[PDB]
Design a protein around this ligand. Sequence first.
Ligand SMILES: *[C@@H]1O[C@H](CO)[C@@H](O[C@@H]2O[C@H](CO)[C@@H](O[C@@H]3O[C@H](CO[C@H]4O[C@H](CO)[C@@H](O)[C@H](O)[C@@H]4O)[C@@H](O)[C@H](O[C@H]4O[C@H](CO[C@@H]5O[C@H](CO)[C@@H](O)[C@H](O)[C@@H]5O)[C@@H](O)[C@H](O)[C@@H]4O)[C@@H]3O)[C@H](O)[C@H]2NC(C)=O)[C@H](O)[C@H]1NC(C)=O
Ligand SMILES: NCCCC[C@H](N[C@@H](CCc1ccccc1)C(=O)O)C(=O)N[C@H](Cc1c[nH]c2ccccc12)C(=O)O
Ligand SMILES: *[C@@H]1O[C@H](CO)[C@@H](O)[C@H](O)[C@H]1NC(C)=O
Ligand SMILES: *[C@@H]1O[C@H](CO)[C@@H](O)[C@H](O)[C@H]1NC(C)=O
Ligand SMILES: [Zn+2]
Length: 598
Amino acid sequence: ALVKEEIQAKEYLENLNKELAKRTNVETEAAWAYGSNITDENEKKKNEISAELAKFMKEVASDTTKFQWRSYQSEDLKRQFKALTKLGYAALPEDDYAELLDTLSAMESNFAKVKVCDYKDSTKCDLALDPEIEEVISKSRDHEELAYYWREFYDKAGTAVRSQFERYVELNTKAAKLNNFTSGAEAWLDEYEDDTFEQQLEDIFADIRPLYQQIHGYVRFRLRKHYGDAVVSETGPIPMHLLGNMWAQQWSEIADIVSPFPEKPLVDVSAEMEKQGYTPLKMFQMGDDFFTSMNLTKLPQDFWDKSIIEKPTDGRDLVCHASAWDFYLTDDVRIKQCTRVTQDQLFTVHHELGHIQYFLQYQHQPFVYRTGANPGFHEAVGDVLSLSVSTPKHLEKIGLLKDYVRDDEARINQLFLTALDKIVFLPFAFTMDKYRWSLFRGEVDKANWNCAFWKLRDEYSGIEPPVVRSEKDFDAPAKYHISADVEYLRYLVSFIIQFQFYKSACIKAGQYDPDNVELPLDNCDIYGSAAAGAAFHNMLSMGASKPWPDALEAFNGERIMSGKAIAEYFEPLRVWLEAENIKNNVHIGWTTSNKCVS
Ligand SMILES: *[C@@H]1O[C@H](CO)[C@@H](O[C@@H]2O[C@H](CO)[C@@H](O[C@@H]3O[C@H](CO[C@H]4O[C@H](CO)[C@@H](O)[C@H](O)[C@@H]4O)[C@@H](O)[C@H](O[C@H]4O[C@H](CO[C@@H]5O[C@H](CO)[C@@H](O)[C@H](O)[C@@H]5O)[C@@H](O)[C@H](O)[C@@H]4O)[C@@H]3O)[C@H](O)[C@H]2NC(C)=O)[C@H](O)[C@H]1NC(C)=O
Ligand SMILES: NCCCC[C@H](N[C@@H](CCc1ccccc1)C(=O)O)C(=O)N[C@H](Cc1c[nH]c2ccccc12)C(=O)O
Ligand SMILES: *[C@@H]1O[C@H](CO)[C@@H](O)[C@H](O)[C@H]1NC(C)=O
Ligand SMILES: *[C@@H]1O[C@H](CO)[C@@H](O)[C@H](O)[C@H]1NC(C)=O
Ligand SMILES: [Zn+2]
């Protein structure tokens, strides 16, 4: 009978979940050791343990066919069994899996080991992305210096890894088809449990796109006044090396030269952080404080004992790209961040601690449910708090922002500053996966792979390389997530839903009322709010036990991903900017880039 089997299945799942958590702990430890300390020995260990876990997953997927799980009464049991059937890369033959693992570590270690020569000292060749190159890209206003570092980095992080990336695409595709997905695109999209997810995002993006075009146009206009028309054209895509970020994904680093009102305050607390003696430890302690103030979970002792919150001073290679780690026991959670004392980094700390909080909130769940409601949910958590810490309201409380008058002009400055991160990012994030999906789906011939990347960056973001590129270059893997095989759509989802979360948290905190001029959404601080924290607890504790619309519903009663909230936040900016662009006869839109030779 199926009655007796469903009882046995429940016992089978309880044991297997515990076994999976314990086996994944071992894998995670090896992966942590490698990311903290890149050596051939640690690479070998990381990959061999992963191969062992993959072999066990195969046996598990095989064992699920012994249970008539699709016939069960319990939605919960069926959801767990379905999670176990999804093998991903572990579906590959033993040898193919080992090759993929070797290919993935080759790309990630290449990225992490990139060193360039000083622009002004051809003998000093130990400059790493974090912190040396990123410091220049964010600070220098010498367009030739910027172009030098752009070219050096993309050549070493991107082009060097073309052949490995090609084999990765091949094996990612083979794995997807062994799971009976059309391609790795569909394998990734499966995480959102919604067959209309792509269309939904297209629809949301199309609504926000006009505002992006206005921001793009205004930024280009302001850059022309700074660099001259020899460097920046009125009608062409913006040369990307001028945007304060290696990938032009966020433009907040050039706010000082593109801010709407330069005679009025622009929030940049990095200087005051240094003046007050801020350390990486203090930054993480302050993040911890924010979470506990909302009646959420305090960081466990293991976190403080085991985390790496400063770049090691020895000679060693490591992955500095900030990350948060769940070890699948109790309270063993960690961050590895090469923390610097800057405003941007203070947000990064809060982002990473958002992941940590999610880990702690769902650690009581069965193993298969110990992940986000969807990948976008995991990315949104910390950003919701960062939206609060970024407000003049909060920064004044912690004494990082002094003598600030919040008039109409200062408000536009702050809204614009926020948009340089939040709106600008949306087409960037969409293109990262639009590009990879098109390769996964076999829609682009190998001979056209590089210009296919730059074509998307042009079409969606209106940016282009500083120098002419061709199919002799391969620039995509110059972005961490592309070398590290990390799905990117999670961030596009996050940047939309984080405003749904923020708006609701602010309403719950009594910090936002659309009919009260004293409580605007863009100055909401949810610090100390138990009510906002309660909504987070309700949602985060669920993990992946229910489809994501149920997790959203637990937060604010809503079930639909919507661009209403983000548009509501930036509405005052939209009104001002549209008028300002008309006032200054600002050209909107761009001609097709000439910077990738087919
Ligand atoms: C991705 O899609 C793939 C299809 O494109 C799919 O591959 C198929 O998986 C099937 C397993 O679900 C498998 O079906 C079996 O076929 C056996 C004979 O296959 C031969 O001929 C094929 C030609 O079509 C060849 O391709 C093969 O190489 C073989 O030479 C059958 O022997 C087998 O049967 C047994 O199992 C069924 C179980 O079904 C249930 O059983 C319960 C009992 O507990 C019943 O209550 C229930 O009603 C139901 O019947 C028994 O019924 C039966 O008595 C036998 O014991 C089975 O039909 C198929 O071969 C395989 N390939 C192809 C090409 O079809 C992958 O599994 C998919 N991958 C993922 C990850 O989902
Ligand atoms: N200087 C900013 C660093 C932000 C670190 C983060 N890192 C990722 C790590 C992803 C990962 C996956 C698998 C194995 C190891 C690591 C994260 O924690 O989400 C990330 O990739 N972040 C951003 C995208 C981003 C979303 N929200 C943010 C809030 C602030 C800043 C950036 C972001 C990026 O594209 O760089
Ligand atoms: C880094 O790893 C090597 C071996 O791969 C090990 O001998 C060494 O102790 C590690 N270094 C540090 C600083 O932990
Ligand atoms: C703190 O959270 C607990 C449960 O996590 C809850 O019972 C308690 O009411 C919360 N405190 C406040 C002040 O709401
Ligand atoms: Zn993240």
